[PDB]
Predict the structure.
Amino acid sequence: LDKIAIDTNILLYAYDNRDLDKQDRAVEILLKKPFVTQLVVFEFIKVLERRFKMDKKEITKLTIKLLKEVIIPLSLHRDIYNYSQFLLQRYNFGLSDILVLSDSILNNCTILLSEDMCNGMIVDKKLKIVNPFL
Amino acid sequence: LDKIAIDTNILLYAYDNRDLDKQDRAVEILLKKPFVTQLVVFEFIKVLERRFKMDKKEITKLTIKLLKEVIIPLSLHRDIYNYSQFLLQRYNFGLSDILVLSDSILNNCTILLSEDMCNGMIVDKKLKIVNPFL
Amino acid sequence: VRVFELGSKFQVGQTGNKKGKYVEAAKGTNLFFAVYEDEKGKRSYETIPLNEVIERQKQGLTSVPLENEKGSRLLFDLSPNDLVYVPEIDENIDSN
Amino acid sequence: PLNEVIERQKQGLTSVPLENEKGSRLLFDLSPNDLVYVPEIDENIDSN
DNA sequence: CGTTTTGTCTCGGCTCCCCGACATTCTC
RNA sequence: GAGAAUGUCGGGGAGCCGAGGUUGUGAAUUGCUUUCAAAAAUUUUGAAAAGCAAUUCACAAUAAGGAUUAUUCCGUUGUGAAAACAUUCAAGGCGGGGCAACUCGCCUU
DNA sequence: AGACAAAACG
Ligand SMILES: [Mg+2]
Ligand SMILES: [Mg+2]
């Protein structure tokens, strides 16, 4: 009834256990097989290897695990850059966030889950950001 | 006769004019319509926005121009992560470089152009790295 | 008397009874003709309807999709009065 | 075909490609003796 | 598939601005 | 060659209105086809439903769409990347016109 | 009347 996507922060909060409630919430999202964008996967890999210094082998294995059983990667859309330029005029965010939103919308995603994106804001009348942890 | 790909450093040396000879060499490569991997594009965008602080609008416009007229983006291959895990056991590089090589090989790329990848090394008997600036 | 025809006519609109109106492309509106090529090297051709071009251009995107359904990357699009070069049968113009 | 599976497993990849020529995403692969559930005609098992 | 054939919205009134070509007289 | 006045013939742009046609909704009447569903001798007659219509009437839309509550509108024109424009565009004052809204002139920056 | 868009014909 509504295609749902996620950002890196959701999977990070899942991976982090300092915050039991937020980790629980993020894992609760993942029980719904939410969609996701490949750029989210790449950014997750980078953050894993930089902040947490985890091994390349372990990070790759977990990426494969999650992409195989829990979540669903979204095929990169060739119209991502043109649309992102279209979104930039009306929207002033980080180009990375703009790219994520561009790909999510181009895949008909109806809800995007993230914190640092001015929650509740509607992007081009096609996708409303939802902040779940509140 | 041999599919040719590029890394971020080639386009960076093109974009940089401090080094006339290296910029010339990199632009010379680009005259051949070399293939490229989307991750190269994203990493190029990041480096442009961080080191050079260029505007989002200008970076997006240049990305669109280059992808339209000079180079050819390579569709992301869904077997990138599994192959990267396969490559990691036999190869010890940065996971980003491993991902770039994985996607290049998965697209039948025969030559990869880059510096910081131990030039001349053959990856799984399918793609030989070429260091052009020497 | 109501005479019928078998063909491809698209609805005028989507609101009210406009869904029930079927029309044909206006004269001189097939302005775009996309040519893709698959990895193998085979060529695929398409004609983009005007409404699709209108929507794509409104979205700030290119008039023609850069890939077809099969995933063949778009070689280029042709429009009336465009100029093309046809290589000789022996010629191999890849990066001429 | 068994051959394609042989190359895919040699490369460290999954036995079945995750996407077909049309780009349709791979729902799953079936093998002999695998068990499947067929929902009722009225049942809508999408995230059951 | 390669080619030719076929069909394609139509009619009425009235007003008020502009421009140019051609003729006539005269002046500079 | 330029200008002013007076006629003729043409061209361009804009505006206030009108009548159909088409598609679709509903109705009155009559049909063709199929199926059910009976009666009768594979064939004939009758009820019901669906598809396709015809004749006539009321109504809805008429470039997809986007504004607005003024008795207002923009959407098939031209330039060209700025997706930006052209096709409305100042201020006063001194008057004419009206049932007044609104309309037509004069004077100085 | 003209020339495009697509049915129609082999
Ligand atoms: Mg981010
Ligand atoms: Mg690198």
